[PDB]
Symmetry: none
Subunit: 302 residues, 4 copies
Amino acid sequence: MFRLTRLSNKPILSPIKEHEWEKEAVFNAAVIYEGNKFHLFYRASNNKFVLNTEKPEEKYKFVSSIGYAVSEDGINFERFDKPVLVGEIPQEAWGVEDPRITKIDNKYYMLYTGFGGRDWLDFRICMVWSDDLKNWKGHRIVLDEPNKDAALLSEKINGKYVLFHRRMPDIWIAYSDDLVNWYNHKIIMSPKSHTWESKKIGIAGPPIKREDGWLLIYHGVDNNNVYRLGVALLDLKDPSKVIARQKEPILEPELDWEINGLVPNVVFSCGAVEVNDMYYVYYGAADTHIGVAVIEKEKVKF
Amino acid sequence: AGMFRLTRLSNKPILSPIKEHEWEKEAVFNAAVIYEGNKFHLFYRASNNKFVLNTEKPEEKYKFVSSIGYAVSEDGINFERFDKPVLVGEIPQEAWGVEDPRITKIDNKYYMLYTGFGGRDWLDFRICMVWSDDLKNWKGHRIVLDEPNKDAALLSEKINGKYVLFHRRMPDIWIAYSDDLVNWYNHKIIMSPKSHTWESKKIGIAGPPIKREDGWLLIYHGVDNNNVYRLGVALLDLKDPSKVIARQKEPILEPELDWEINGLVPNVVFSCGAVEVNDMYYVYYGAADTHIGVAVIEKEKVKF
Amino acid sequence: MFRLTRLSNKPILSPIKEHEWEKEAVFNAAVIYEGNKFHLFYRASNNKFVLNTEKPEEKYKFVSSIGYAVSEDGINFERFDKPVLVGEIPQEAWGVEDPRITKIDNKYYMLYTGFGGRDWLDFRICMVWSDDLKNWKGHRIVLDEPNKDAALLSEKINGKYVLFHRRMPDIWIAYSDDLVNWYNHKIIMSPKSHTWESKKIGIAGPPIKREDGWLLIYHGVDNNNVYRLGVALLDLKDPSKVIARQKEPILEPELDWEINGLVPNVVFSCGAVEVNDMYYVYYGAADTHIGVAVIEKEKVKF
Amino acid sequence: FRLTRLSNKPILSPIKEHEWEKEAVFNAAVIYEGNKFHLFYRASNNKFVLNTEKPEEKYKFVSSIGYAVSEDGINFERFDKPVLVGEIPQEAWGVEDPRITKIDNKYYMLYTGFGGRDWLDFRICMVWSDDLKNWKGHRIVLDEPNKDAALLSEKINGKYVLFHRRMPDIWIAYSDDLVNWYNHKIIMSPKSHTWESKKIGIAGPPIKREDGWLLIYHGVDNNNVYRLGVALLDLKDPSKVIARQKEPILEPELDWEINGLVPNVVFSCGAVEVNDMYYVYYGAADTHIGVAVIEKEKVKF
Ligand SMILES: OC[C@@H]1O[C@@H](O[C@@H]2[C@H](O)[C@H](O)[C@H](O)O[C@H]2CO)[C@@H](O)[C@@H](O)[C@@H]1O
Ligand SMILES: OC[C@@H]1O[C@@H](O[C@@H]2[C@H](O)[C@H](O)[C@H](O)O[C@H]2CO)[C@@H](O)[C@@H](O)[C@@H]1O
Ligand SMILES: OC[C@@H]1O[C@@H](O[C@@H]2[C@H](O)[C@H](O)[C@H](O)O[C@H]2CO)[C@@H](O)[C@@H](O)[C@@H]1O
Ligand SMILES: OC[C@@H]1O[C@@H](O[C@@H]2[C@H](O)[C@H](O)[C@H](O)O[C@H]2CO)[C@@H](O)[C@@H](O)[C@@H]1O
Ligand SMILES: [Zn+2]
Ligand SMILES: [Zn+2]
Ligand SMILES: [Zn+2]
Ligand SMILES: [Zn+2]
Ligand SMILES: [Zn+2]
Ligand SMILES: [Zn+2]
Ligand SMILES: [Zn+2]
Ligand SMILES: [Zn+2]
Ligand SMILES: [Zn+2]
Ligand SMILES: [Zn+2]
Ligand SMILES: [Zn+2]
Ligand SMILES: [Zn+2]
Ligand SMILES: [Zn+2]
Ligand SMILES: [Zn+2]
Ligand SMILES: [Zn+2]
Ligand SMILES: [Zn+2]
Ligand SMILES: [Zn+2]
């Protein structure tokens, strides 16, 4: 069994008080390694998160945006003044959350949760795409249902686009010919009772291709809503089949900025990249900061 | 294999929703059919909305309402339709509407069995029944069984002076008998799903059984572990329709076309009605809970 | 990868309409093999089982009794005119259910469900014992709580008596110094979501000792309340640890009198014995009849 | 280090003649005043069916708080009737696990009020007295399923300090006024794959030392065994744990700690410094009260 190792005992990205769109939280970041650079697309909030009201209240409204950051080394990032993605009004009035970015044939697809704030089920999987990581277009609701924790596979299977999603509480898979209409829905992995992953699970970042399968980092939620990261392996030719699944988490809230924050007891990844035989896993910490942790590819054994 | 299958009559739906009609804005599907007066009489389920089914409870913000529409055809392919549904859910006992009608003619009366859905929880459904003399003036509504239950049809004649009801306490096809079309007794399971097959999660009757010389033709739907709906066939003993004397292993219809694979509920073919015309079985089927198609098989090809 | 084979396509015991106490059902039978004879202690009902009322109602009252039958060949049994155990009033006023009998040293312990009918939770694990399978005494409430599916291990572990029980929906284990007071409660086995054993599980008969561990036949209930038998293997020295568990059931309702009956879709075993290098598994069918199915001991492989 | 029991027998046990303490006496708060041990103990009229989907009227148990006094800390005098019972519907199933803290010249008793309507229908409640006899001013401390609550015996920077237990951690919070709590944070967490893996909660109120605040706590393992552990809080900032012992200081060992209404439980709501010793009173199997001690000089991390 193997574990992620943190590159820092401090966040690598933290809120910026003088930018309203990110003055309270930066977390749950997609990442893509291209042009020998880490391109990070992070969720950012203008406010703390009041989640225990009967409905989302205007007086506690938070708005998520997607910011951009770039790094040579994966640790030190240059950041920018304005977010690169904001929500459309009114269906995404409370913003755009938890992006997962997948490259498929020289196009970049960002899958995110659009949240309208009209009730606590007013969220859905949305998708935009670009050819340059810069000019995002083609917005669509991927599944018109309350759903999230979505990612595209980086290649087609038998000609079909492959979507991971999360009808509560399982990781689901589905297929598409046109990136519009989805079919062959199937549960692929389920929570495990009396474990750290008992309440619900969901995909982390998009799966990483290996020789032995697709690496599926995921998050598991226990009975007290603690988020941890786990890891499984999907079959290479049929990624709807799980062929291995580690019992122990690979990352858990441990540092004080992972245990305490806007949402306590959370580590959460929307993105991970392979650079020089190392997996770099970017993670939100307590829905407040961003950390990064790694594992050598050789140590990934099932 | 040495099996038989339906042949689609057309590669496009024979009925589609109409966006300008609220009551059939998103879906027309799961249709009852009666051949009378040399006309196909089709009674289709229609929905005003998509089907969000993954919530823990039915949510009013995702409410869908099913109505039952009427369409009529001479060739079984091209249908005339109408502005308004012929049956709606009475509010609030059938607040989310009336679903999947099955129509059976017995002694010059027509009996429409449908699922009434109140939407108060996911078990808030029941078999209801209305009847008519003329396929036009439905009346006599009743709850057939006071229990969560659906996939119900009456047999077209009595057996030893008893009415025969097919129903579906999850996950099996059940039979039951009545003297008065009000009280049912001697409930028995007659057919069950088969593990590790296309019909593993649950089964239910399709349309009402069709009388043959060799028995009762029982088209049914089977649901696999991923909730794909396919159609199968079995044969019931002519004198005792509680006994299955044959059952084909492989389905006779399954999602193939894009408008059967993709739709409001992906991967569904579902029949509520099939009729014998000029020694062919015309099987009308909902497709992805969105459109209606028709498939056929020559009566002589039904061999087990 | 292994399954039971029915010895008969008809019940070996059925209700006796002339006997009020066993007029509607005989099922869920404990089994002891002694004196070259099969001893069956079967649940018997005077009535069908209406269960869908807010509370247990006198007009739907059913009474469970425990009858006895004995067989040399395992198929033809000698039966008796009256039951050998009936419920004490008021705590067992609706009778005594699903006995499991374990021989520990030279005493036989029968654990059964006493059902008082005062509420749907008005049931508990009770125990009586005998040295001769004839004179039962020493009645006690094993756990003073709603609980069932109980059996004693046939020997002590580290000087402790071992109890298997079923706080919903798991198979539990507990230990005792004195067969009165129980401690070290532990979940040992849980349902598995999206399978035939998703809703709940419970022990079948008392576990059978093998060289490679304890054979733990159990029942699993799916989302449609279908009851099937499965099989696991517990560690020989620490039976609280499961070392193997077959994925597929070993017995499922298939025959008309297993699928149809007072409670549809049930096969349920309260006893299994080893006879001539074969396991004999007696089972209730549709809570109405008793069947028997076997497996050659050499075919029990995980 | 570890605690040492003073008796291999309970020092308090249920009295079947008294309905309110018919089945159990356990989880007792204590303070030392007037050179007397004042013990405030939870008491139940019934066994504890916990495995139902919701709490059932047919299996209802009612906790009361009783009073007992001792001079040696071992032999206690007891009384016919409880001192606190549930008055209102939020306390329909009674009042549980009191922790008493003296701040300025007043005594505050924080306890769990349990309404029995569902298994989350429990709240941290508080009453207070001048005299340990007349409790007043009942309030819900936090309007949320929470328990294992205690007040610090002093203010920090003029703020009252509350320890609580949003599952599964020990939390701290601050109040200007004992009404509104803010700056909630997690100060200590379970350790997975150990005796304290499933959840932890404060025991009695922390005891002031010169090296910090002594934080006895209970840990719960994967099989629901309750044991006691000990940690040390920074003296000036009790949100900071500066030491924590790996192994328990008390676990079920005697037969009336292993066996009982809730097996495999030792649990303390109360401990006091008396003659250079910590006296740790504990419930055992949620059925009896025992007491164990440690020489304060022996407390080393
Ligand atoms: O998309 C909105 C989203 O909701 C939150 O997720 C969960 C949800 O609101 C509910 O409260 C559930 O029981 O717990 C929350 C997570 O465990 C967060 O993901 C939040 O950041 C988002 O706005
Ligand atoms: O009668 C309501 C009915 O429910 C749906 O049926 C199924 C049910 O909701 C459950 O979710 C099952 O597992 O999946 C659905 C179909 O498999 C639909 O039939 C729906 O159209 C109806 O309103
Ligand atoms: O001990 C009474 C016992 O109850 C039944 O078990 C279950 C129970 O009544 C409840 O309805 C639950 O939801 O499902 C039942 C079985 O799945 C039977 O075991 C019955 O025969 C017994 O009297
Ligand atoms: O305040 C009610 C309280 O509940 C019990 O606590 C726990 C709870 O019911 C739940 O079942 C948990 O998993 O285990 C119980 C103890 O670990 C007891 O503390 C009980 O005495 C109280 O009444
Ligand atoms: Zn700026
Ligand atoms: Zn959107
Ligand atoms: Zn699931
Ligand atoms: Zn998630
Ligand atoms: Zn772990
Ligand atoms: Zn029109
Ligand atoms: Zn109706
Ligand atoms: Zn059906
Ligand atoms: Zn095909
Ligand atoms: Zn007789
Ligand atoms: Zn009893
Ligand atoms: Zn469980
Ligand atoms: Zn059971
Ligand atoms: Zn299977
Ligand atoms: Zn007295
Ligand atoms: Zn209160
Ligand atoms: Zn606690």
